[PDB]
Design a binder for this molecule. Structure first.
Ligand SMILES: OC[C@H]1O[C@H](O[C@H]2[C@H](O)[C@@H](O)[C@@H](O[C@H]3[C@H](O)[C@@H](O)[C@@H](O[C@H]4[C@H](O)[C@@H](O)[C@H](O)O[C@@H]4CO)O[C@@H]3CO)O[C@@H]2CO)[C@H](O)[C@@H](O)[C@@H]1O
Length: 490
């Protein structure tokens, strides 16, 4: 078989705020010239947030899709495909967020009187950037549940963009499932102080989650069990907490129970919303996708504190990602792992970071469950080092010059399309990165040639019981990686 079979597509995220808070597509002209540069560089497509907070601003079911329709049109004119994010979260308190885009005011208004719709930490601070999983099924939003809101939104998107969908412009739908659109709790909120090097805090203190937990422990036979009170604060180090130190809580009957409860809430959150998405896009030629954050800090200590915390119950003897991947399999969905570029050697030593190991674990898990795996770089990078790292992860075993590679990622979405990217020296480098992703082939407009034809979305396969999902916690050995890519940028 042909080299083309080694091609991994490359997408570029558009600027945050290309459609502003007023639901105005600001500067089509400017964007156009940028897109035109990407098309000439060989870029396959672009990625864009479809802000819930801009679209359904006015009131329940009051959608205005017009500015996004103009944007999609322009993208289509430029010869690019598109990955659309159903962004149900706020833009603003996370790294890189240069524009503030909140969730719908009308939802914020309800929150003014029911503060428990937001993720809450132990001190009672409410995070407004995303609705707590606790209200997924509470019919408190003018008669609707949170899940119904998301569902109606994606139905409306489908119907109103049907022309673009049927013309094959949209290739994937990324379903926003938490802060930054990631399936995770907001355990590391910059808006609350949290400084990169730190463990984060558990976010299950709203009343709904707290009631759920209390009932569950009672059913387990331990009504007296409480939510964690010895876990420390955002910038703690594990050893300094009662929860995470060795022989700490987190290895106690109660701790295991809580951790399982806390991580399973995400699993179920993701599973139910994907169900709604699968129904909304049923029959369309798109793939569904979710985003999983890459929390590499503390990975190298037994407690994996930052990962627990974020809701990923991942230890050295309990695979907390594979279950996600298994969950995604019934929906035929892609696991978009949002950190690909980092090297262990670039992290401060005291962070106990294992970015490369984390990556091998998460991808392998996906490949092992037989789902498609994609990813993004986490921070803005313009150097060959970064690029070669992404290329290695894209094809961990190198290129197969006589067939499809044994392992390959389904796609990579580079982090943001800025002036910087476009500067002469930086752009020259990017161009090579694109070439190497493409396995030295020219841009290939018809993805069928490289075994990426998109078929009409099928209905999800039947529910997998939590017990079965939880079987995927069994640790496995990762697939083997080359030390270096066989296709470098230099
Ligand atoms: O336009 C699309 C979305 O873009 C923005 O969200 C993206 C993040 O900016 C990008 O990093 C990533 O998410 C998480 C990373 O996987 C995770 O590593 C971590 O990043 C750490 C980093 O590793 C550490 O070295 C650094 O110094 O601290 C960082 C944490 O602040 O957290 C990232 C965020 O959870 O992908 C995201 C989604 O595409 C916008 O914020 C989002 O609103 C847009 O929807």
């Amino acid at each position: 078989s042909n080299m083309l079979l080694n091609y991994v597509p490359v997408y570029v995220m558009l600027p945050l705020g290309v459609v502003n808070v007023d639901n105005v597509f600001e500067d089509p002209d400017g964007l156009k010239e940028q897109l035109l540069q990407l098309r000439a560089a060989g870029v396959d497509g672009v990625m864009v947030d479809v802000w819930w907070g801009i679209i359904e601003l006015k009131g329940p079911k009051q959608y205005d899709w017009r500015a996004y329709r103009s944007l999609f049109q322009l993208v289509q004119e430029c010869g690019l495909t598109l990955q659309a994010i159903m962004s149900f979260h706020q833009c603003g308190g996370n790294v890189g967020d240069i524009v503030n885009i909140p969730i719908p005011q009308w939802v914020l208004d309800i929150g003014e009187s029911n503060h428990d719709i937001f993720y809450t930490n132990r001190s009672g601070t409410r995070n407004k950037e995303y609705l707590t999983v606790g209200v997924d099924n509470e019919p408190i939003f003018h008669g609707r549940t949170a899940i119904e809101i998301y569902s109606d939104y994606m139905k409306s998107f489908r119907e109103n963009m049907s022309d673009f969908l049927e013309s094959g412009l949209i290739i994937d739908i990324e379903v926003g499932l938490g802060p930054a659109g990631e399936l995770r709790y907001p355990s590391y909120p910059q808006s609350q102080g949290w400084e990169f090097p730190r463990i984060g805090e558990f976010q299950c203190y709203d009343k709904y989650l707290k009631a759920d937990f209390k009932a569950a422990v009672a059913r387990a036979g331990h009504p007296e069990w409480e939510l964690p009170d010895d876990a420390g604060k955002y910038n703690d180090v594990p050893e300094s907490t009662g929860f995470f130190k060795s022989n700490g809580t987190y290895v106690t009957e109660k701790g295991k129970f809580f951790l399982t409860w806390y991580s399973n809430k995400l699993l179920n959150h993701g599973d139910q919303i994907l169900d709604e998405a699968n129904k909304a896009f049923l029959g369309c030629k798109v793939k569904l996708a979710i985003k999983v954050s890459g929390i590499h800090w503390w990975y190298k200590v037994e407690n994996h504190a930052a990962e627990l915390t974020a809701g990923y119950y991942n230890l050295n003897d309990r695979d907390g990602y594979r279950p996600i991947a298994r969950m995604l399999s019934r929906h035929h969905a892609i696991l978009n792992f949002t950190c690909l570029e980092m090297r262990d050697s670039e992290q401060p030593s005291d962070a106990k970071s294992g970015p490369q190991e984390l990556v091998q674990q998460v991808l392998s898990g996906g490949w092992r469950e037989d789902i498609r795996v994609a990813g993004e770089n986490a921070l803005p990078r313009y150097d060959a080092t970064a690029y070669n790292q992404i290329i290695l992860n894209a094809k961990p075993q190198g290129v197969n010059n006589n067939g499809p590679p044994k392992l390959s990622m389904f796609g990579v979405t580079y982090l943001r399309l800025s002036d910087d990217l476009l500067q002469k020296s930086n752009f020259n480098i990017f161009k090579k990165f694109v070439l190497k992703m493409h396995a030295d082939q020219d841009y290939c407009a018809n993805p069928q040639k490289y075994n990426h034809a998109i078929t009409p979305l099928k209905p999800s396969a039947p529910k997998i019981p939590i017990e079965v999902l939880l079987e995927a916690t069994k640790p496995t050995l990762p697939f083997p990686w080359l030390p270096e890519t066989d296709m470098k940028v230099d």
